[PDB]
């Protein structure tokens, strides 16, 4: 019924109900719960804790930034040193009781659980958060690729029987070798490929010391946590799309269209949802308005002009316009550049620079004068063109130079030709001109001087004199 994308966007946005305070706190709690599940999943990894420990080891040595290590502390280097020393001590304890007493022994589980509790009271920077997520993601994906290759090669029920615990164990390989079903001849042939596949698997498992069941459980927990956090974040964004529109309504007619401002504000809103904190007690609009404003205005600064102006110069231009408008109100006439310079505490030359670099390009379809069928682009010359008189003069000069050179000794003519590039692709210095017959810079220089002296004689220079 309509074609305007604006109206379609409002139809799609209106179908989402607006949140309340309780709803905002509930959604924020769900986001935090998902992030906590992901953090717990990453913590149950032999490679994760040593990385944090060595990062703290470098930080406490006053060699690395503290902000890059951690961003906050969960409360239900005055303090960071104590907590990280506790973390180091408990990691030592867990490594002591990880395998000596038994993996199923209560020590290895209780220590890990309280390590999870300790790590839950940490707020890491999102950068190394994604860094740790990516490694396990890649490992799990490689496991998926190898498993799907194995399934494609073998293709069933026999694997399903022994997928639970013997997916990567050599017992499955031995039992397949023992099997004598009619299709197991080709399966035994493919066992050579499966051998290399599982040999590649062995390195990754010892890198994790978790076999297959543990990594599958960690992957499922992480996937569930990320899905839950993503759903909550999407709900918040869809709730606040209307706030994005209300903010973006005020920056129309500044080089960008309405939907562009809406989309930039939406990106700002997503960034705000990524870093909201409901413990502070403020409502979501208060924090999100700043980020939506920033995104929209940075987008205007970067994409509203055919010739891009840097952000600092954009601010200078805007504040010049504001000061000029206040001074116009103050004195009743346009502010001259020196008065503006004095009020800006900047040089007048800088003011003039800002003044002429703050003009948008004119359109080539703009009519000239009072006409309406005329266009500016119809009156623009091609200043790069060469006049035919100049081309004819160049051809005449070439002919005259050839005739003059023909009246000289072949050696001098060739030397001058090489030294000036006539009838040649490149010009040459005295060295390679000497390289012709006798490599002599002082000699080549003398013969060039002689040639110029003879060409300067009025007897054989009246033809070339007319070209000056």
């Amino acid at each position: 019924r309509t074609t305007d994308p604006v109206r379609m966007y409002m139809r799609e946005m209106g179908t989402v109900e607006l949140l309340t305070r309780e709803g905002e706190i509930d959604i924020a709690k769900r986001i935090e719960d998902g992030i906590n599940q992901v953090q717990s999943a990453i913590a149950e990894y032999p490679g994760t804790i040593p990385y944090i420990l060595e990062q703290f080891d470098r930080v406490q040595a006053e060699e690395l930034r503290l902000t890059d290590l951690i961003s906050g502390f969960v409360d239900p280097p005055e303090l960071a040193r104590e907590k990280f020393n506790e973390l180091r001590g408990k990691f030592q304890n867990l490594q002591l009781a990880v395998n000596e007493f038994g993996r199923d022994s209560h020590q290895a589980s209780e220590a890990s659980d309280l390590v999870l509790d300790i790590f839950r009271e940490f707020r890491l920077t999102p950068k190394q958060f994604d860094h740790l997520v990516e490694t396990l993601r890649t490992s799990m994906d490689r496991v998926r690729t190898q498993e799907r290759l194995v399934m494609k090669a073998v293709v069933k029920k026999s694997f399903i029987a022994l997928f639970t615990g013997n997916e990567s164990n050599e017992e499955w390989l031995d039992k397949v070798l023992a099997s004598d079903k009619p299709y197991v001849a080709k399966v035994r042939e493919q066992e050579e490929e499966i051998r290399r596949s599982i040999q590649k698997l062995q390195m990754i498992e010892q890198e994790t010391s978790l076999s297959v069941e543990r990594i599958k459980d960690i992957s499922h927990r992480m996937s569930i946590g990320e899905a839950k956090a993503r759903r909550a974040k999407k709900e918040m964004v869809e709730a606040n799309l209307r706030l994005v529109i209300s903010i973006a309504k005020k920056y129309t007619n500044r080089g960008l269209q309405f939907l562009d401002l809406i989309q930039e504000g939406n990106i700002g809103l997503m960034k705000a949802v990524d870093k909201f904190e409901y413990r502070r007690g403020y409502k979501f609009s208060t924090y999100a308005t700043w980020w939506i404003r920033q995104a929209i205005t940075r987008s205007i600064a970067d994409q509203a002009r055919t010739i891009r102006i840097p952000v600092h110069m954009i601010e200078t231009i805007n504040k010049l316009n504001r000061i000029s408008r206040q001074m116009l109100q103050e004195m009743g006439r346009e502010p001259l550049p020196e008065e503006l310079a004095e009020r800006m505490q900047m040089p007048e030359d800088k003011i003039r620079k800002v003044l002429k670099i703050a003009k948008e390009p004119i359109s080539m379809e703009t009519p000239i004068g009072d006409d309406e069928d005329s266009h500016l682009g119809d009156f623009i010359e091609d200043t790069t063109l060469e006049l035919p008189l100049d081309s004819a003069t160049a051809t005449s000069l070439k002919a005259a130079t050839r005739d003059v050179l023909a009246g000289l000794t072949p050696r001098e003519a060739k030397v001058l030709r090489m030294r000036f590039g006539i009838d040649m692709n490149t010009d040459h210095t005295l060295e390679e001109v000497g390289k012709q017959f006798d490599v002599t810079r002082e000699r080549i220089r003398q013969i060039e001087a002689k040639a110029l002296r003879k060409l300067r004689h009025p007897s054989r220079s009246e033809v070339l004199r007319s070209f000056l």
Binding site: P5, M270, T306, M313, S466
Partner: protein, 1202 residues
């Protein structure tokens, strides 16, 4: 170099192949250094260096490093013009539908996918899902799912089916189509179909599908994945004075596209909610649509100037587009313009050209001659000499222009006589001097007119100017063959004054030895110019066979007539001069000189006539004065009588005897009769005078009144204008058109009062506005005609056809409207002209009918002949010389290579501005209608026979009672259907009434085979048919205007040709315009160029397909040579616009109008243009295949054959 232009869809790989790089940022230039930014819209790494043989680094900065790519920057060391040729590309994050293949109705995507456009937009606008792979499910491809339904069936089935939304869905649907399978399915369904609507739909879709299969195009290429980017120098960002920059709107559109694409990529990287991603995809589609065609999808995107941005479609299309502004017409060098004055001393081949203007125009020639003769050592010295204006430069200029023809042009150029070549004569001044005798050709008068001048450079152009375009070659009108250099105004007046006769003038009755002694008597004041004398005249007569008979005899004449005989060329009778010479008489003199003596004699005679006329108009002293307007004394009495009788009629109205309408009508008739009587009395008083003769008596003499002489001679003025000067202005009309009862009873000599002047202004304003608007209407009509007929060239000599048209004198009542001689002059006989009542072949086949054979036809009383026509020509391309006949502008048979279609279109279009039973003879009666034949056997009365004194063959004596111009021409040439067309008999058979079904009635006809054909007739129709009557095919059942299409269907090609020609000629002859019928026949031939196939046969033609007739004829000839079933067709009549748009070449069709439709159809079809017509070769810069270029093209057609 190239032999054809090929159009088609562009694949992503092809667009990538065109590209020299990928545009990744919307940056254009730095704001300080003004240098191109890397990976931007102006990147030097993609499009080329900004300075010749340099890089942005400045490291490689000479020709020594040509072709070397700098490692620091990446800019190739080459020329800068490469930035006009190098293209780029954008890798779109999501597929985008092409707006032309989506919304240019009919939609190609919808037609191919057999889904309505609304559904396609719903899928595109992310409102509805569509199934791509149905899988093992009841779902079918192309069936729409709402989000609710999609979620439901996603839970129900899972991954069995794939459903998508957007342009990706349409691309997947188009990619999965099996084109041969669809073609087979439509063919099978067309075999077993009866409804004509579904037949039309399947035939259209089948045409599209098989075009796609044949062309090699893939349907999914209609959805864009890679977007090409125009070279920067075609969308320049250039500095203006003061630091301002001028830019093209394409930069704004491209920046929008790039920004939205980058935002889409960033949103997909951030894993945004689906609503935001859908929004961004909608915006990307909108931006690409705006870049391609702004305003087609919806609200046009506007810039900061609050006006819509100009897109690529606007670049290529429209009156201001590239085709018409820059390709079909151009600004040229070696050209000038100035005001035109009159040179009465010039010769017909000469034009006065200013010295400074010639110096600027012929500058390279002057440089060349200065260098050649050693006056200038170099070209710069020559430039200095020319700038200093030395005398030797003037001598060089004279030697340069000595025999160099120059082309003079005046806008508007309505016909080819608007450009003519002259020999320039250098004159001091700033105004061009134009020969008077050519002004009528140019429609040029000296009230502020300006002319343009062009210098032909090469030898071929100079010889074309001398041989074809020179004014002495063009003295006949190509539209009618009549002379176009006929003298006018003062010339005529002078020739009128010198040849008049006066009673009892000085020197009457004198005997003169010849013209020389008449001149001597005039110069000695012995005899007046108007003295009746006897002069010895030696007259030479050149007969038709060439016999030259010289007779000397004494003739009664005047002094002026002999003095004028002094300049008449030998070979003409003295009777052409022994009369008073008005415009018609001088026209006859020139025509006889051309017909009996040739071209050189005619040119010399015209020059001498114009000299003599000017001289004796000067010597006459003819002047206009207030006493020359003689108002008759009867005017006041007539006005009084009319007023009194009007008062009587008003009294009768007050008595109720007559109604108001009767009163109005009879008052108007009263005043019209009064105006006629006053005009007659004024003319009678002004035309005659009384003189005393030699005997002393009173004799009546024709008046020498200046106004009477001006009007009677035809110099200027008519009867109506003299009426207005010295009689009554008459009844005037209101703005709507009604006539005001009281007329203007004053003339311009007495002066009008305020009311009379206001009434006059009412009509003056209407006339001026009508002229202003009809100018544009006529221009559009002429352009359409030129487009439809531009391909018609005389390609052969004889096509070897026996067909022809039947020609008879035009009878529209009791008198001949036009003679058979005027119709037959210049046409080639198709069937032997046997003498009536005899078997002697008077005129054989294939003989041109000239004046001699026209006299032969007239003498032997021949009524009907048969002649070759362009409509009946059998040539595969163009026409042949015999079917065309005489070239009216040249007088002989038309030459091969003559572009007769352009001549026809110009001939018809030029006069568009001027555009707005009792027997009377003795003979026998013949019935066919009613015809009254004379004793000689010629039909001289053609009368209707509504459904009589004398029966068939009964002789009848004399007196026995046997009992909106220009719109009309445009509607005739557009084959428009009348509002209430005549119902014609579809088939021959017996009429029978029928069941009067409610709403409108039905009738039936029984054919010779007994089959019943049912006809559907509206209620309000005065049927002329009666049951039991065998109405012939084409017989009128209900009266009304006849549709030309019905005429073609039921009567044939000859009938529709005669209908169109007769109606157009009626419109033109009402206004007195003489245009030959062969031009109209050429246009009608271009109207009859398509045929719909009724029987498929075995040839590669589908039933119900509109294809070119020439292709069918060639295929039928080949199949007959192979002895196989030929195709059967019905010829179609198209309007000139539709015929122009349905030509074979897409270059011409795109250049005409509707560029988007033509280009879209050609692209989907994969058309190939062979460049066979004039417009294509004009656009590509090649020689046109007509005239001097004709032979050239023929040679190429040989080399391709070998």
């Amino acid at each position: 170099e190239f032999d054809a232009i090929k159009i088609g869809l562009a694949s992503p790989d092809m667009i990538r192949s065109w590209s020299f790089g990928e545009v990744k940022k919307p940056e254009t230039i730095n704001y300080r250094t003004f240098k191109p930014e890397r990976d931007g819209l102006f990147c030097a790494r993609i499009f080329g260096p900004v300075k010749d043989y340099e890089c942005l680094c400045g490291k490689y900065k000479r020709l020594k490093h040509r072709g070397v790519i700098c490692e620091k920057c990446g800019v190739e060391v080459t020329q800068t013009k490469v930035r006009r040729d190098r293209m780029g590309h954008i890798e779109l994050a999501s597929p985008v539908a092409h707006i032309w293949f989506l919304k240019s109705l009919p939609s190609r995507i919808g037609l191919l996918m057999d889904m309505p456009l609304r559904d396609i937009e719903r899928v595109l606008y992310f409102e509805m899902y569509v199934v791509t792979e149905p899988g093992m499910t009841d779902l079918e491809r192309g069936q729409m799912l709402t989000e609710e339904e999609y979620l439901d069936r996603l839970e129900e089935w899972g991954d069995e089916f794939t459903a998508k939304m957007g342009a990706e869905a349409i691309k997947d649907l188009l990619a999965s189509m099996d084109l041969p399978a669809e073609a087979e399915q439509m063919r099978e369904e067309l075999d077993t179909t009866n409804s004509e609507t579904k037949r039309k739909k399947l035939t259209k879709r089948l045409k599209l599908v098989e075009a796609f299969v044949a062309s090699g195009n893939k349907p999914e290429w209609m959805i864009l994945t890679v977007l090409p980017v125009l070279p920067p120098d075609l969308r320049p960002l250039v500095p203006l004075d003061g630091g301002r920059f001028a830019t093209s709107d394409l930069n704004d559109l491209y920046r929008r596209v790039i920004n939205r694409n980058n935002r889409l990529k960033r949103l997909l990287e951030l894993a945004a909610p689906d609503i935001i991603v859908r929004n961004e995809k909608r915006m990307l589609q909108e931006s690409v649509d705006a870049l391609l065609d702004n305003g087609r999808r919806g609200r046009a995107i506007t810039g900061s100037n609050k006006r819509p941005l100009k897109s690529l479609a606007d670049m290529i299309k429209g009156k201001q587009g590239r085709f018409r502004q820059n390709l079909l017409g151009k600004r040229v060098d070696y050209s000038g313009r100035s005001v035109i004055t009159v040179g009465p001393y010039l010769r017909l081949h000469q034009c006065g050209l200013p010295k400074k203007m010639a110096l600027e125009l012929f500058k390279p020639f002057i440089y060349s001659k200065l260098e050649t003769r050693g006056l200038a050592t170099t070209i710069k010295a020559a430039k200095k000499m020319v700038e200093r204006e030395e005398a030797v430069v003037w001598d060089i200029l004279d030697e340069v222009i000595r025999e160099h023809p120059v082309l003079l042009n005046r806008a508007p150029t309505l016909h080819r006589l608007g450009i003519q070549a002259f020999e320039p004569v250098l004159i001091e001044g700033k105004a061009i001097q134009l020969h008077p005798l050519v002004c009528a050709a140019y429609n040029a008068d000296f009230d502020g007119d300006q002319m343009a001048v062009h210098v032909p450079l090469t030898l071929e152009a100079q010889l074309e100017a001398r041989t074809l375009m020179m004014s002495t070659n063009n003295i006949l009108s190509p539209a009618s063959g009549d002379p176009i250099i006929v003298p006018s105004q003062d010339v005529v007046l002078g020739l009128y004054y010198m040849t008049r006769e006066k009673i009892n003038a000085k020197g009457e009755g004198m005997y003169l030895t010849g013209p020389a002694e008449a001149e001597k008597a005039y110069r000695t004041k012995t005899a007046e110019l108007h003295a009746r004398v006897k002069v010895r005249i030696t007259e030479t007569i050149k007969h038709e066979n060439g016999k030259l008979t010289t007779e000397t005899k004494m003739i009664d004449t005047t002094v002026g007539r002999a003095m004028l005989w002094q300049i008449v060329p030998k070979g003409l009778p003295y009777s052409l001069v022994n009369q008073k010479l008005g415009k018609k008489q001088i026209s006859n003199l020139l025509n006889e000189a051309y017909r009996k003596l040739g071209l050189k004699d005619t040119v010399i005679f015209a020059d001498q006539i114009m000299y003599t006329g000017f001289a004796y108009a000067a010597l006459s002293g003819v002047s206009v004065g207030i006493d020359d307007m003689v108002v008759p004394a009867a005017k006041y009495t007539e006005i009084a009588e009319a007023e009194e009788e009007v008062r009587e009629i008003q009294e009768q109205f007050q008595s109720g005897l007559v109604t108001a309408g009767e009163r109005y009508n009879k008052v108007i008739d009263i005043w019209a009769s009064t105006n006629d009587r006053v005009a007659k009395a004024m003319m009678e008083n002004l035309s005659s005078e009384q003189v005393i003769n030699r005997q002393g008596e009173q004799e009546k003499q024709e008046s020498f009144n200046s106004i009477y002489m001006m009007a009677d001679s035809g110099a200027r003025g008519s009867a109506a204008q003299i009426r207005q000067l010295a009689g009554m202005r008459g009844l005037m009309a209101r703005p709507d058109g009604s006539i005001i009862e009281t007329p203007i009873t004053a003339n311009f000599k007495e002066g009008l009062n305020v009311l009379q002047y206001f009434i006059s202004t009412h009509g003056a304003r209407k006339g001026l506005a009508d002229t202003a608007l009809k100018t544009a209407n006529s221009g559009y009509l002429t352009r359409r005609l030129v487009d439809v007929a531009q391909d018609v060239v005389v390609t052969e000599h004889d096509c070897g056809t026996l067909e022809g048209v039947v020609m008879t004198p035009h009878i529209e009542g009791g008198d001949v409207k036009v003679a058979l001689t005027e119709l037959a002059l210049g046409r080639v006989v198709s069937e032997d002209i046997l003498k009536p009542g005899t078997d002697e072949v008077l005129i054989p086949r294939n003989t041109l009918l000239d004046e001699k054979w026209c006299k032969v036809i007239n003498d032997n009383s021949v009524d009907q002949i048969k002649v070759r026509s362009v409509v009946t020509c059998d040539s595969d391309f163009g026409c042949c010389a015999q079917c065309y006949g005489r070239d009216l502008a040249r007088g002989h048979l038309v030459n091969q290579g003559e572009a007769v279609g352009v001549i026809a279109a110009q001939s018809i279009g030029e006069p568009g501005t001027q555009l707005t039973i009792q027997a009377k003879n003795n003979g026998s009666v013949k019935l066919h209608e009613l015809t009254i034949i004379d004793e000689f056997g010629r039909t001289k009365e053609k009368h209707k026979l509504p459904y009589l004194s004398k029966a068939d063959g009964d002789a009848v004596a004399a007196g026995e009672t046997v009992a909106g111009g220009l719109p009309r021409v445009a509607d005739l040439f557009e084959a428009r259907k009348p509002k209430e067309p005549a119902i014609l008999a579809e088939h021959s058979g017996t009429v029978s009434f029928g069941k009067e079904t409610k709403g409108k009635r039905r009738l039936i006809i029984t054919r010779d085979s007994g089959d019943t054909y049912e006809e559907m007739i509206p209620k309000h129709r005065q049927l002329n048919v009666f049951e039991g009557e065998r109405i012939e095919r084409g017989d009128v059942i209900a009266d009304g205007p006849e549709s030309p299409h019905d005429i073609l269907r039921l009567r044939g090609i000859h009938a529709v040709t005669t209908y169109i020609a007769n109606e157009v000629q009626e419109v033109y002859r009402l206004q007195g315009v003489k245009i030959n019928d062969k031009h109209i026949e050429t246009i009608v031939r271009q109207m009859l160029r398509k045929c719909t196939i009724t029987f498929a046969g075995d040839s590669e033609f589908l039933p119900g397909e509109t294809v070119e007739y020439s292709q069918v004829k060639i295929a039928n000839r080949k199949l007959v040579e192979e002895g196989k079933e030929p195709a059967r067709f019905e010829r179609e009549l198209l309007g000139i616009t539709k015929a122009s748009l349905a030509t074979e070449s897409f270059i011409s069709a795109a250049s005409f109008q509707e560029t988007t439709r033509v280009l879209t159809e050609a692209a989907v079809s994969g058309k190939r243009d062979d460049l066979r017509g004039l417009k294509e070769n004009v656009i590509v810069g090649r020689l046109i295949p007509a005239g001097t270029g004709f032979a050239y093209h023929q040679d190429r057609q040989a080399k391709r054959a070998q």
